Each structure stands twice: as C-alpha cells, then as structure tokens.
Amino acid sequence: LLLQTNLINYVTSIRPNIFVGRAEGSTQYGKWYFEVMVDEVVPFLTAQATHLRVGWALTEGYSPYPGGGEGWGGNGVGDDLYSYGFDGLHLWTGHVARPVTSPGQHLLAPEDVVSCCLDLSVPSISFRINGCPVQGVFEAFNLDGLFFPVVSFSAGVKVRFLLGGRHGEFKFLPPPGYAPCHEAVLPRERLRLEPIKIVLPPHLERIREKLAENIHELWALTRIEQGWTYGPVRDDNKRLHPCLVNFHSLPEPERNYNLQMSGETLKTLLALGCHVGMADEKAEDNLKKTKLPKTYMMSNGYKPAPLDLSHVRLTPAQTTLVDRLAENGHNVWARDRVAQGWSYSARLVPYRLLDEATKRSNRDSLCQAVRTLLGYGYNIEDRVRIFRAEKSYTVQSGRWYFEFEAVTTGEMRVGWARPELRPDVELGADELAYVFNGHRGQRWHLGSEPFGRPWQSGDVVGCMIDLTENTIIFTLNGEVLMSDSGSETAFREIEIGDGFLPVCSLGPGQVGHLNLGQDVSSLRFFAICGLQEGFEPFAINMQRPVTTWFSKSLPQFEPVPPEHPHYEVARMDGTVDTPPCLRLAHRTWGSQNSLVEMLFLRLSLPVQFTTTYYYSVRVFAGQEPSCVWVGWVTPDYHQHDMNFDLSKVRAVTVTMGDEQGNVHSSLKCSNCYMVWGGDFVSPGQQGRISHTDLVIGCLVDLATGLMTFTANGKESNTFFQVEPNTKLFPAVFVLPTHQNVIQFMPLSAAMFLSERKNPAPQCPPRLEVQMLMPVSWSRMPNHFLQVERLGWAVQCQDPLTMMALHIPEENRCMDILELSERLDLQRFHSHTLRLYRAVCALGNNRVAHALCSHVDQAQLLH
C-alpha cells in the first residue's frame, strides 16, 4: 500500500555492432556463436550482489536507462520480454528467475567464460559454461528484429569479448556450423562497442546491335591495350584465358547472358518515363575522329574508337537512372552469389549495405557503357529527444543567456519554453515554446517562419531572454541573427506566465552540447553580446550542475484526464437490473481517429503461489478455449484494446454470475478485441500479432523433462471475430472470468482484500481506466558509470548506486528525485514519513525496531 525505498545499483548494458536477423532474402546463415570471459574481484560488492548476465536482444529492448525500470532499476538483460539471459544458474526473461541444472552450480565466477549459440532457422538460444553443457534453452520466440549480442554488468568487473577475427582465442571449440564473427561482420564499417540508446522489332534490334557490338569490341580493345597479350600458359590467378578469343567463339550461355541483360535493361527503362525518338543520332555515323597517331594502332588489328568526352558531361539526370540500374545489378549479383541463392561455398554480406566501395566500383564499371551508348546519338532524359531544466530552475524575471554547440548540422531546435512543456508536441507548435531551428534557418512559435541563416559544423549559437521588455534574442558566434524584415529578434510582448525554461531538441543522429553557464570558461564566445548588456549566464551561481530532465520514449500508463478533447469516459452508477458500467465516447467529427488505444484498469489481481490455473472467455457458451494461463503470482491488469469507430464504444462493465465473478466488455459498433493483459506490457503500436515470446525450454536427458510452460504471456488476450460469425450490427457481451474460490465472488472482491466475502460488485473511486502515453518525462542522473583491445576488453571499477521508490500497485521502480517535480507523490511520501515518526511515538521502541525493517541504517545515512 505505501511507497517503499531502498538502495539500488546502476546496471549497465553493452553490445557490439553485430547485426543478426531473419528476413526474406539475406540471412548470413542466421546461426551465430559467441564467447566471453569474465574477470572480477567483487563477488559480493559492499552495496549488494553484483549483476552479470549474458544474452541477446532484438534491437527493441531499450533496456539501458540509468535509474528505475519496469521492475527494480533499469535492468539490462532478461528483465523484459525483449531480452534473454543467463547468470550461472538462471533463465531471465521478464523478471523471472527460472533455474537450470548443470554441474558446478556456481555464478559467473572470475577466470571463467560463457558461450552463447543462436539458431534462427529454428528459433533457439543455448548457453554453455566453460566446459559443461546447460540443460535449458529459449525457443519459440518472435524474430521481427535484429538480434544483438548484449551483456549487462555492475561496477568492479572486467570483461573481454571473443571475436575470432584477429584476437578471439576460443578456449572452447566452436560448435558445428556457427559463424564466429567471420563471414560478414561490419561489411561497410568497422567493429566497435556501442551502448544502446523471326522478325524482331527494329528499335530493339538497333539497341541490341549497338550495345552488344560496342561492348564486345570494348572488352577486346581494353584488354589488348592494357597488355593482355597471347600467353601460352593457363593461369588462374590472373585468370588469363588463351582459349578466350574474340566475341564469335564465346561460350553458349553468352547468347542468353547478352539477351536477358538487355531485356531487363529495356524493361526497367520503359518505367523510367523516357522519351523515344531521335535526339542527336549523329556521333554514330557522322563522327569525325581527330588526328590520332598510328602509335595507338598496336598489332591487335582492332581499331579503338572511344568517343572523345574529355570535357563534355552528358547529364546529372542520368545519374539517378544509372544508380537504379546499378542497384538492380547489385541485387542480381547478390542473387548469383550469396544474398538470394544462399550458396554454401568459399566473402560477401547482405545486399542492402554490402559495401560502398564495391557499389561505386560496380557503378563505375557499368556507367561508361551507358555513357558511350548515349554519346553515339541516342540521348535520353524514430522520434525526437527533448531536454530541459527542471521546474525548480524556472526563471521569472531578468536578462538571461545560455550557449549551445551543434556538432552535426541536422535537425535541432534550441530556445526557451514554458515550464509546463507538454511532450508529444514538436517545439514551437503551441504557445509553450519559443525556439529556433537553424536547419533551414527558421524560428518556431505556433508554427514555422523564416529567421536567420542555417547552421554549419559546430556553429556555437547563444540564446538570451529579457523579461523586462519581453524579448528573446538569438546570437550566432557573436552576431545577432537578423529577421527577413530587418527586425532585431522580433518577439515583442511575450507574457511572463509562470516563468521560462531553456529547451533543446535533437533529431536522429544529432549531437549537441549546451552550457547553462555553470562555469564561465565553458562558454565558447561570451565576449560580445553578454557582458555589458547585463545578461546573466543561466546557471551561474551554483556549486552543482543542473538536473536537466529529458523526454522518455517508453510508453508508461496514465489515467485519461476528464478534460480530454475527444476521449470522454463515464461512470454510471449500478441500477437495480444492471451493475455499474463504464462507457466511453468519441467526437465523431473532423477530429482525429488514432489507432487502437490500449486501456487498463487501476488495481491488479495477484494470484496465490495456482488455485485458478486458467481463465475462460465466453459470450454465452464456450468460446476459444485453452486461454493462456500462468499460475504464479503474476500481477494482472484488466485491459481493453479498442478502435474509435465513431459514436460510442466499450463499457468495461462489472458483472457477477450465479456463483462466479465475470468481467464483461459490452460492445455495439464493430470489432474491438477485449481481454486483459499483463502489468509489464509497454509495447509500441501498429501491431496485433507476434508480441509474445520466451517459452521455457529446459528439459531432461532423454527428452523427458516436464518443465515446459508458455510463460511471458504479455498479451494474454483474445481477438473479437473468434466469438461471432455474422454480417450485421448486433450487441456483444464478452464476459471473461478468471477468479473463483469457495463462496460458501465478483471481480471487486479479488482486488481490495477488505470485501472478499462480499458478493456484491463495487466500483470505488480507486478504479479508473488508464491509457499508455507514448512519451513521458524522466530525470537524467547526475552521475554515470565510467564504462579496448584483445576483443575490446572493458573494465568498470568505480561503484555507483542510487535510492528509489517502488510502487507496489504497478510493481515498478522510480528514482526518488523525480518527486521534486511530481509534487504529489512527494506530499504523500512526506506524510508517510510523518506517519512513521508518529507511530514510533515517544518512548515506544518496539515500533522503532519494527520500522528498522521498512527502512535501513545505510538508507538513512544515504
């Protein structure tokens, strides 16, 4: 019921840039083996047990968030549905400590190694300790994403990867048929560690004759002038072929090679919007060759006839067409060799980003042929990160300034903003911001307007505000930016409001470094428009840096505000003939109709140990049976995924059967699947299937191990059309039921443990439908962990920990420093502390002893 606190360490995850995944096309054998060695002297650090886990993540876990997470702290591996792990005897996926049996049941001790192998044709991960096999695997999991080798850790640990390319000395022999970072790793980049976040047509005949004859003369002239003389020996290194003579005696497949290539070329060009006809048609026949000495007429006998274009360029318009042709040729080369044929022989890599050098080499090889053909006369035509100072540092009056530096020249916005900056809104799209985006040289407030010159590399930009005369000024390397109308930063008459706050926003792949003035040396220029104008560097008189809150991307849960524009809920009191109901409404007008929105109830349903072992969904008789069941504690939240179909919608009712308690979701408009979901469900959107994974695959020697269970059932919900089969608009009463115990009943009696004997359903004010907001706020910690050869070994020595709240209702942790602007949980926790002090009254020491469990001496000292 209350918020409990304790000291939590910082868990950090690292991962090499190794891309492995499944798709229709390039696969790279999809099977990979991996080895890592550990060295540490901190089996039990002074704080708590250290963290060290190894596994894979499908490029969407986003686990490393220094601070609180879904469970207790930002756990990196195996504490969600998107990661898998092993720590010596464990199988972690979604905060579950699944045990395994293996000889020498010890943790990842020093001077030891672990091996991880991944099969993708059949989805499976297996682990192996230094010498012995492990009796547990993961399987039957989603593959929609790239699987990345990851490792989580705490301080005091040195860890070395094993690549095998240059210094990976595998102490354990590789398993039979797994690539040890050999075939294709960083094909277009390097390797480095990276923390996460019978009558043919005449036209065709003419084109074929031109292209084929010209290119066949080409190869001969090119080789014979390079010096490819008639050698007697048959060499394979240089691949000189003395039997290879002029075009006439080319092998039999040469005819089809010539025909099909030009056929595909013309078919592709037909869809490029070309224009057939005569444009020049002169250099082919009326060509007048300039005086060329006969020295170039070497004993080959074949006259070289290249078009003289030492200064003439045809067109940059053909560049895109040649690029498309080169892409198609690269695709068919991939088909021939690796990416589409999957030939097992011995190289190459996926066709998407195989190699820029190889792509440009192929482009140059195929560009000159088209250039010569055309010169003969046939001329032819995922979000944004926002950062701000906390509401504590809100500036109310005065003249203030701070600087910023843009390492890149991409998408960035810098300026001021109101303290109540609502996220999910681009800067300058409302009254709540006054920002500048120099990518196109624009100012932003209630929209975009032209203002100033665009950035360059670095390009330090300073931002100042003067509340005395209600102005905002932008300077660029010591000169004020100018508007199109010649005004001096025209922002007259800006309301003071509740103060102002610095704000920055960066797009994808953008790097910025802003200084609030904590130390005046870090101010890059600060010598022109800040000194004698009286402007105050923002964070000038402070001995500690600024908190600098930022914008999270993980979609946490929040109640629907009653003032929502077009999402209005209702709480009807239960009548005589019907229990209380919860209806929703939508503005069936020119308003937005967003994707299916996931709704959730406030209280959870912990399960003992079993005792229900299943759940049943039904309209009036047995619907889709074998609904996924778990049988452990597994806190469970009533859920509802509905789409706005105009008019009205759900009605998450509260029903009560003759001797059971069923929750009902009435519906009238159209299809909306409505069954509850887990408490840890925080996915994106745009997806209905393949969001559950990680079935436990521990077994026994002779395939007799009976410890297989389809756990991690995040989306423990059904779908609508399973129940009805008709083409009409009737009403539907889906009544799922999970709870049932000795009644000698309803949903309300299973969540408050105070009316458990009461059979009457109730809807107290605690109940409230929620919804997951795409973006919330989070606090950047004031400190971070410190962390290069022989597999890029990395060490972390300096310890670091934090104290954070944990909400029992949602079983989630949250850094306690957030209360400083939460401002409500802060008041509740202050009153909780007062209650503790009161109940430990004067001279009552047994209660003090009892409280010494809820709080700790180290916690109080911290």
């Binding site: 444009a279 067109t315 005046v520 010598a527 428009c529 004698q532 105050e536 008189n541």
Partner: protein, 516 residues
C-alpha cells in the same frame, strides 16, 4: 502559360493599320498587369516546378519584347515591363528553345544604337535602351550557358568607355545604367584579348580560363594602378570613374578564389586608400551616395586584419572631429539672436546631412561586423577609436534642431539613423571606458545621471568610487576583467573621462530614442 500568348499578335498590325491608313487596344493592356503580377510573385516556380519548359516559356515571353523595336513610344508602358523584367531569372538536352540564339540580337540591339546617337538631337536621348538595368542583372540564377555569356558583349565596353572622360560634352545620360552591364566575371570562363582581337582561333576553338592561368589577369593589372594613382580633389578628374571602378573591383573577387586570394585584399586596401578623396567634408553631393551604394563590400579590409585601416581610421576620426566646430555655428545663430539665422540654416543643414551619409555607412557595412570582436578580445585593438570618436555622437544627440536632416532620408525613397549611429559601436566605444569588467561604474553612472552640466560632472568625477561587495560581481565581473585586462589600468580620471560620455549617452541618445 502559353494559353494567353495568342492575343498579343493580333493588335500590332491593327494599331498601325487604323492610324497610318478599339477593343484590341485594351485586350493587350489588361493581360499586362495580370500576367506580370503572378510572374514576379511566384519566382520560386523555377527550380521545383516546370522542369524543362520553364526556359522555353520564359524565352517566348522575352521574345515577345521585340514589340519595343517596332513600336517605340515616348510614353512608357511600364505596367508590364517593370514586373516583366524580373522573369529573366525564372540537362544538356535543351535544344527546344530557339531564342537562345536570338539572345545575340537581343543583346546587340540595345547597345549598338549608342554609336549612332552619340550626338544625343534637341530632346532625343537613350530612353529606348535605358531599361536594360533589370536585364543586365545575372548574378546567380543561370539556367543555360551556350558559350554565349561574354564573348560578344565584351566588345561593347569600349563604346561605354568612350564616354569615360567628360570631353567638354553634356553629362552622361545613364552613368548608373552603364555600370550594371559589368557582371562580376560570372561567365564560368574568361580570358582577355583572345576573342577581342584574335578571330583566327575564335571560330576554330573556347580555350580560355585553363590555358591562360597567368594570362587571364591582364585587365585588372592596368585598371588597378591608375585610379589609385589619381588622388585629385575635384570630382572632374574622376568623370566616369565612380561608374567604372566598382565592376572590375567586384569581378576580381570571385575569380581564382581557390588559387589567388591576395587580389581581393589588394583591391580593397587600394580603394580604402583612395577614400582619402572622399574624406573631405563636401565636394560633390552627386557622387557621395553612388560610390557608397555601388560596392559597400569588405572582405579582408578591416582595422584589425589590416593595420593600414587602423591608420585610415585615424584620418577618418580626424575628419569627424571637425563636426563639433562645424555645428557650433548653430549655437552661434541661437545665441540670443546674434545674427540672422537664414544665412546659417542652409549651411548647417548641408554640413549635417551630406558628410554623415558616407562615413557612418562605411563602418556599419562590414567594419563594425569585425572590429568589435578584436576589441572584445583585447582592449588595444581600437583603443584610439574607443577613447575618441564619441564627440561625433554628442553633436547629433544634442541640438535637436538638426533632426530636420530627415529630409535627406526622405529623398532615398520615422526610424531616423541618428539614434542608431553608435548602436553598432554601443558595445565597442564604451566597453573600454571605465571599470571594463568591474561593475563599479553603476554607482558613478547613477550619480552622474542627473542632467548635470559637463563641467559639474567633471568636478564630481574627482571623488572616485569602488565596490567590492559580495554582489553579482563575484564571477562575471572581477573574474573576467582581470584576464581581459592585459595591462591593468589604474587611473580614476582617465576612466571617468570616458564615463561622462556614457552618462551623456544615457541622458540624451537612448532616452530620446525611446520617446522617439
């Protein structure tokens, strides 16, 4: 765009047929403004729209301008031409347009008639060709080149250069419109005397800008030494030099930028030295705005990068200092009606309006965009212009009767520049004045801000005041005054001596600017 071009051809024959031997007259007059307004307004149609036919249709519109040759009217039909001159600014396969070849006649027709009408006879003038100013402007938006960029028109500079000297004839009709014809060498290649004189290679091969890597520079070498050599007082020895000097100076800037960079600075310093001719108070009011507006561009010719500009600024400030005694004539007339004010009003108006039109613009063009950086970096960058040149602002700040100078701004086409004269220098002139970064000047400025007399303020300035309070001056002031002060100056009189200038600025300039 071509749907409405047919109506143009029907009226030209009927106009002469009816007179020499109607609804049609208005049927051409009406489309003029309608087409011209949108054509000038939607100038962004060029690049993202009308990918290939834009050139052809603009060329057809240009070829429609041949009507001026047939029907020469003394009365202007500007309602179309003024806005149609702006359509000129609005891949090797571009043979569709045929007036790409008529461009030669379009260029030659205007300039060929000046030789015919050199007599210029009772009232006849160059009004037919005077409109070429808009057409001659081709700085950036070049669609087609066709090698017909400067081969022919370069022959027409000599007809213009024939009227360089006065030659005891009536003044030039279009000296300003003569200069626009000189583009800043933006023809993608150039070499002198090969097409001008050698016709043997012109028709055969255009081999230029690559073979003569050191022979391309032959016109600037003769055009740079001579005008710098002349430094005469009167404007007659430069009879057309104001109209002929800006274009060669501008052209050499872009040329050989990646290879030869000293030409720009050489030309800039040469013109800066030549400005000693303009330095005197009043010699020719006609030449003052023309030379200033022709080329107010400075690349590497500021006081800090070029120490010669430091010396030139001394002469400029010396010229400026005379303005106090110059404006004292106003007080002479205002001293209890000492003499009739009419004889002095005109002199004061001229001496206040004309001289300030050039010097203030010169610094604010690009010199005030570079000097304050060095001045902030070190106090010795422009200490001469810091401890001085403040007296110029005082004359205009006081003597409010001089606000009539706004008549000078009136002829340009009220945010008068008088308030903004030290605006660029408001961070440079008083930065090295008193307590550079100490904040101790706040008390002195507050004490002096009582509309006190100059003598009384000077007497009060002898007291001296400082403050080492635990105030805001912890880490901005007294922490960046010291590193910024290379040689810590300790002189109360020398600092208050610039402090009263700031106090007077507070009392007069911005205090009135806010009311104004």
């Amino acid at each position: 765009a071509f749907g409405f071009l047919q109506q143009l051809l029907r009226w030209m024959d009927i106009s002469q047929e009816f007179i020499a031997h109607i609804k049609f007259f208005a049927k051409i007059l009406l489309p003029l403004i309608n087409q011209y307004f949108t054509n000038h307004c939607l100038y962004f149609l060029s690049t993202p729209a009308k990918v290939l036919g834009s050139g052809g249709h603009a060329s057809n519109k240009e070829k429609e301008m041949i009507t001026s040759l047939f029907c020469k009217l003394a009365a202007l039909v500007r309602h179309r031409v003024s806005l149609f001159g702006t359509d000129a600014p609005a891949v090797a396969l571009l043979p569709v347009l045929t007036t790409l070849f008529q461009h030669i006649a379009q260029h030659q027709f205007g300039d060929d008639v000046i030789l015919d009408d050199v007599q210029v006879c009772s009232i006849y003038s160059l009004g037919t060709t005077k409109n070429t100013y808009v057409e001659k402007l081709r700085p950036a938006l070049g669609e087609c080149l066709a090698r017909l960029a400067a081969a022919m028109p370069v022959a027409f500079l000599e007809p213009q250069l024939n009227e360089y000297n006065a030659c005891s004839v009536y003044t030039t009709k279009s000296p300003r419109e003569r200069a626009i014809l000189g583009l800043p060498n933006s023809v993608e290649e150039m070499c002198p005397d090969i097409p001008v004189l050698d016709r043997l290679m012109a028709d055969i091969g255009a081999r230029y800008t690559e073979m003569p890597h050191v022979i391309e520079i032959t016109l600037p070498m003769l055009c740079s030494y001579l005008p710098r050599w002349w430094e005469r007082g009167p404007e007659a020895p430069p009879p057309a030099l104001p109209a002929g000097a800006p274009p060669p100076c501008t052209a050499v800037t872009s040329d050989h930028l990646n290879s030869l960079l000293g030409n720009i600075l050489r030309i800039i310093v040469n013109n800066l030295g030549i400005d000693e001719a303009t330095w005197m108070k009043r010699l020719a009011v006609f030449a003052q705005p023309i030379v200033s507006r022709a080329r107010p561009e400075l690349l590497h010719s500021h006081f800090i990068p070029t120490i010669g500009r430091l010396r030139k600024r001394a002469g400029k400030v010396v010229a400026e200092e005379e303005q106090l005694r110059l404006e004292a004539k106003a007080e002479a007339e205002e001293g209890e009606l000492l003499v009739r004010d009419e004889f002095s009003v005109l002199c004061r108006d001229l001496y206040a309006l004309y001289p300030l039109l050039i010097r203030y613009v010169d610094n604010n063009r690009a010199h005030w965009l570079t000097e304050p950086n060095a001045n902030a970096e070190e106090l010795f960058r422009m200490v001469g212009e810091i401890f001085i040149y403040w007296s110029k602002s005082h004359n205009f700040k006081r003597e409010e009767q001089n606000f009539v100078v706004q008549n000078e701004i009136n002829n340009m086409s009220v945010a008068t520049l008088k308030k903004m004269l030290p605006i660029g220098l408001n961070m440079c002139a008083p930065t090295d004045q008193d307590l550079i970064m100490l904040a101790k000047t706040r008390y002195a400025l507050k004490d002096t801000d009582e509309e006190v007399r100059e003598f009384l303020q000077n007497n009060l300035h002898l007291q001296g005041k400082v403050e080492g309070s635990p105030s805001l001056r912890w880490q901005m002031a007294l922490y960046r005054g010291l590193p910024g002060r290379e040689e810590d100056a300790d002189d109360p009189e020398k600092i208050v001596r610039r402090v009263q200038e700031v106090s007077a600025v507070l009392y007069h300039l911005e205090q009135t600017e806010h009311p104004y």
